[PDB]
């Protein structure tokens, strides 16, 4: 708290207080730990020589380095007051001392366009053609190696560039580690005037014009993309320039000029040997409605690639092949055309259209760029990237006024998918597919809740099936961060219960019908007790922060018919069931209501089968599980083949005859030691 | 073959056009892709001669192509007015539209065709008409723009002042988004043309507190453009609100300070801009903007609080560093926030290293390459084709600056190597290793799906495998990957590295990976602790030939110990095993020939404790056949827990572990004998 007010005093520029505290013993080489700023560093930055003098009076080191390795000498280059540089030079071991990224005081004078300061340092031994030596991580990615001229050229300081080349013997064709010269730095400056002057200077000194910058672009290409005919003329004056150089994308300087609607620039390029075998220029000019340029390319005319690209979607394959072939302007990384041929579906605002994002096929959901709906969709999607059962999110792109959200393209909606597979199974077979779809949804919605989000509009058109029969949740425009109202999670759970019934009924019942039913009507329409119990627990959940849904994945609804039969057999093999030990812990657990279908169960079984098993079966639950265990073990023997014919497949037998059995046993043993007999879930 | 009907019109030789008309050829024929008529194409090329010849052979001048454009409206762009006068006698309405709402008048406004614009004006063209578009694009508030808005955007100064002063153009007409011509004007790259147009629109009363994209006002747009002049012209209005904010919450002054523009900052303060929209002095100080810091100091951020840190990381290993990176100030590289400093460094690479980052405010790992790097290009190519692969590290995106490719990936806790070290103590010496199975089955799926996607990894090792906070395994690092279609045989080296990884993970990391790569295939197999592992690794070193991986997920290596025991019990309960019917199909599968020699279960009745062997005896005596051992296992399984057999239960312990240790080859033997038979039914259900 003493050095603290020394620091505070220097920023307010209260000079007496600075003297007082140095007299009082305040450390002038105190470095704040976040970024390493010294009071001498901060003094040079604010340009107050009075403060620079008083601190130096009290032994403050002028080559003390902050986090980036900069000394208050190097910071003086940035300030560009020469009398500060005078005051510190007597103490500085090397005038070419650099920071961790290789910046010297002379470079910093070049960067900040400090003419008076760069002269001073020039006379005092500064290296003019110094390249920046940086840390090893940065050099292995070929960063660094820039020079004072490149910095001056990029920031457009014409004053500084002139002096460097003429007065200071600056190398014009010095390169950085990536291979760039000052010419390419010069051509990236937004101001046309300053760019024009600097390129002229650099050219006359012998700056190479066949060099490669970002995107493998040449100087000429950069000048064309800038739309500046002047810089094109200057670079065309050199004859050893390669006019038919191509960037990373395979585009040539002429091609871009035609594409960019630049008549003057196009003609001038042709009249300097630019080949017209780079692309179909007249189609491009025709598309741009430049009649005059079409004529020119035609009057100069004397007399296409191969289409590699293949879509992975088979439903959308032919339309994507078309969209890939046509020309469209890019919206960032997105290629899209708003036409019914490329439309997937209709929405509350904008529609779903096929698109290409980074040349990958996607579904593009459109919103107005201001839309609250568009904001919640993107916010929820960007938190869901680890949720395997949520549709993959590529990215969002905006133009003037439309937010495009790009998503993984799926084959079918849940509804369509159920329709296509509706004739696959015979009427009364076990429905594995309903389990897979629903367990996927439970995980999807459960993970979304752990993410802090609730969907708020779960229905079969928001659920998509990919080429490999995976189920994915989509459409988060009405989603909410559920901490805002934790009780609206129940709406997700209710829609899940309707989706349970919807999928179990193979889509024969519409979702609209099901939403118009009451809870009791939904339970009645359920074909079995497992489904009934599950839907019940979704409408009457417990209380959980996205733990609830994963728990219900252990519910016997998601147990196969073999696993259900296996659990009843395993329970019926407990010692105390076979010995009918009625004080036992197991039988006390199955102790007890509403007349179950297995009360008086020995009467409901075929009398031949009942007779032969007896080799004393009472109407207890314990005795029925023993019955199931025994039959399970001996059903396949030669001795029992008539029994086997009457029973058929045993799992289905007991379940049809006693529909509440599995659920009853599950409820009695669910939080007990005998849970171990349940299938692994 | 009549493809000259329109090849002739584009070559503009009229000799072949007139003669083509009387040679079995139509004039209103529309090519199906875009709908271009020869009359459409004639007007676009500005040929008075071709439009004349075709129209005196009946060609309809209100014929539409795909966007609903007529040859009339497309005359609006070309601007030639005597083609407009040749076609007007044949057109019902001069305000006719294309599907996007565009008139012949606005296309004249867009292309700055002054002489064409006034022709249409005095022929009744509506100057204040807004575009009526398709219902899709109106529901996202697109369309509704004016001829003035088009003139303003394209910078045509001539056209703007004629519209305002000759043609009674509404200056504050809005589009469906809520924009006026002022905001269209300020998006124009040319400073001069922008200056002139803004002046005109301002003097006629164009609202200056409008909102465009991003909820930016005209003033904010002028500051972001770095143009002092447009700023002064805007603040000449007194009704303007200088403290209007954008959607990001920032105001015109704050941006000016952030952007290093003391000119514009000072002028803004001198016109009522509040100085508590941000800590301006800290911002100017960080920009080394000495004179600006002095200025703001004389007046600044005394009454301003920066929002309290309402952001929490999900990673616990990297939590502390991400909290710091969220707090500090950094410039954005597109959607990426990163700082290259050792505090935020995750690992070293051969190019650039791995650093913590924030991408769309999500924590990520940022792998850096040279923007030219071939290895950087293969990494993103393979990542972009793996977005559906659940067991590949999630790919957020790539960002480039001047000269560095940043690849942003899901942040994981630990490397496979680190993870096996931390959990080395978790299992008891002789208990089942579930974790080895989960890790390996995830890798099998990962590499399998990567192959279906057309890629091979080519450098599988434990440093390229990451574990997340929920113990899920993810494959990463595809800088050396290849499209295997060029050379389909090189996926075998992925399957070899998988073989090594199997042994590596089963040994809980105690044998190094370098050791294992220096071993031969036979040495690796002999180092395996059980026959399941041995068999699996064998099938990875000798695979082929393609989707071996998916099939191997059914291998008994991935069967739990309960399931292994369950299938031995279920095979042992077959009728023909209990009756010892040796002619049966099952026992002909199991124990055919002269005998079952050279296996730990030859004379198996001798290897079992004599108490338990005795008490199991109720022919009629367990023989040294495999059939009788599975019967043995079935019988014990059913009665082991009964009160009468408590002592047997204590000698045996957990029965699955018992039989596997005393007969290590048993499970694999039964598997091999029954694997493509009907008795496959007894195997556990595996992955679909
Ligand atoms: C309402 C609907 N949504 C979708 C699809 C998506 C949807 O709503 N969101 C999506 C996000 C990504 C993606 F790949 C697809 C969708 C479809 C294909 C449909 C649909 O079914 N469209 C009409 C064709 N069928 C359904 C009724 C009879 C006609
Ligand atoms: C070699 C290595 N790679 C990583 C991490 C990743 C890695 O190599 N690739 C990744 C991609 C995504 C991601 F989230 C993480 C990585 C770490 C943390 C390490 C590591 O172990 N760093 C500390 C080095 N210490 C640990 C043992 C002695 C060296």
UniProtKB/TrEMBL annotation, chain A:
Ranges of the ANK repeats in the UniProt entry = 35-67, 68-100, 101-133, 144-177, 178-214, 249-281
Residues that hold Mg(2+) 2 according to the record: 462, 475
Per the database record, which ranges form the KEN domain?
561-681
User: Where is Mg(2+) 1 bound in this sequence?
Assistant: 457, 475, 477
User: Residue limits of the Protein kinase domain?
Assistant: 338-558
Give the gene name: RNASEL
Q: What is the lineage of its organism?
A: Eukaryota, Metazoa, Chordata, Craniata, Vertebrata
Taxonomically, the superkingdom here is Eukaryota
Keyword terms of this UniProt record: ANK repeat, ATP-binding, Metal-binding, Nucleotide-binding, Repeat
Record GO biological process: mRNA processing
Q: Which residues form a coiled coil?
A: none
Which GO MF terms does the UniProt record name?
ATP binding; metal ion binding; protein kinase activity; RNA nuclease activity
A Pfam family that this protein carries is Ank
Protein name as it appears in the record: Ribonuclease L
- Which InterPro entries does the protein's record reference? Ankyrin_rpt, Ankyrin_rpt-contain_sf, KEN_dom, KEN_sf, Kinase-like_dom_sf, Prot_kinase_dom, RNase-L_RNase
């Amino acid at each position: 708290s003493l050095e603290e007010m020394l620091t505070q005093a220097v920023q307010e520029a209260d000079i007496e207080q600075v003297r007082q505290l140095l007299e009082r013993g305040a450390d002038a080489n105190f470095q704040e730990e976040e970024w390493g700023w010294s009071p001498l560093h901060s003094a040079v930055q604010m340009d107050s020589e009075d403060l620079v003098a008083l601190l130096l009076k009290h032994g403050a080191d002028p080559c003390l380095r902050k986090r980036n390795g900069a000394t208050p000498f190097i910071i003086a280059g940035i300030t560009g007051n020469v009398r500060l540089l005078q005051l510190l030079l007597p103490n500085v071991e090397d005038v070419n001392e650099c920071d961790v990224n290789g910046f010297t005081a002379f470079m910093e004078a070049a960067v900040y366009g400090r003419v008076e300061a760069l002269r001073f340092l020039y006379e005092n031994g500064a290296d003019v053609n110094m390249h920046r030596k940086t840390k090893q991580d940065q050099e292995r990615i070929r960063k660094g190696g820039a020079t004072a001229l490149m910095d001056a050229a990029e920031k457009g300081h014409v004053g500084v560039v002139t002096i460097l080349l003429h007065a200071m013997k600056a190398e014009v064709d010095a390169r950085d580690n990536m291979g760039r010269n000052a010419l390419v730095y010069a051509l990236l400056n937004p101001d046309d005037g300053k760019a024009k002057a600097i390129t002229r200077l650099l050219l006359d000194h012998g700056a190479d014009v066949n060099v490669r910058g970002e995107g493998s672009k040449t100087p000429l290409i950069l000048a064309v993309e800038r739309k500046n005919l002047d810089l094109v003329q200057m670079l065309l004056e050199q004859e050893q320039i390669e006019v038919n150089d191509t960037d990373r994308e395979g585009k040539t300087a002429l091609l871009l000029a035609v594409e960019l609607r630049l008549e003057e620039i196009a003609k001038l390029l042709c009249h300097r040997g630019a080949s017209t075998n780079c692309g179909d220029l007249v189609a491009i000019a025709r598309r741009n409605y430049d009649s005059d340029l079409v004529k020119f390319l035609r009057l100069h005319k004397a007399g296409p690639p191969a289409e590699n690209w293949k879509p992975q979607s088979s439903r959308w394959g032919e339309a994507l092949k078309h969209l890939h072939r046509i020309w469209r302007p890019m919206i960032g990384k997105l290629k899209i055309f708003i036409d019914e041929e490329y439309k997937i579906a209709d929405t509350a605002e904008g529609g779903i259209y096929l698109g290409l994002y980074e040349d990958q096929e996607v579904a593009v959901k459109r919103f107005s760029e201001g839309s609250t709906r568009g904001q919640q969709e993107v916010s929820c999607l960007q938190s869901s990237r680890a949720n395997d059962n949520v549709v993959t999110f590529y990215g969002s792109e905006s133009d003037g006024s439309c937010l495009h959200v790009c998503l993984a393209l799926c084959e079918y909606t849940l509804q369509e998918h159920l329709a296509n597979h509706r004739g696959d199974a015979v009427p009364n077979e076990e429905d594995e597919s309903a389990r897979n779809i629903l367990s996927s949804l439970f995980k999807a919605i459960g993970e979304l809740h752990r993410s802090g989000y609730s969907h708020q509009d779960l229905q079969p058109q928001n659920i998509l099936i990919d080429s490999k029969n995976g189920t994915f949740l989509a459409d988060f425009d009405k989603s909410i961060k559920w901490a805002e109202d934790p009780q609206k999670i129940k709406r997700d759970l209710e829609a899940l219960g309707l989706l349970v019934l919807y999928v179990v009924k193979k889509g024969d019942i519409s979702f609209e019908t099901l939403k118009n039913q009451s809870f009791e009507e939904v339970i009645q329409g359920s074909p079995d007790e497992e489904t009934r119990d599950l839907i019940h627990h979704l409408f009457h959940p417990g209380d959980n922060v996205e733990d609830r849904l994963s728990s219900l994945l252990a519910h016997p609804f998601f147990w196969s018919w073999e696993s259900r039969y296996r659990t009843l057999r395993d329970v019926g093999n407990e010692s105390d069931i076979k010995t009918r030990n009625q004080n036992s812990r197991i039988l006390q657990l199955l102790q007890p209501e509403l007349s179950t279908s297995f009360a008086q169960w020995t009467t409901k079984i075929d009398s031949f089968v009942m007779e032969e098993m007896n080799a004393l079966y009472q109407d207890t639950l314990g005795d029925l599980l023993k019955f199931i265990r025994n039959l399970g073990e001996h059903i396949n023997e030669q001795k029992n083949k008539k029994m086997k014919s009457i029973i058929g497949e045993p799992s289905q037998y007991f379940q049809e005859k006693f529909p509440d059995l599995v659920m009853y046993v599950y409820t009695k043993l669910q939080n007990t030691e005998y849970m171990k007999h349940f299938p692994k879930t």
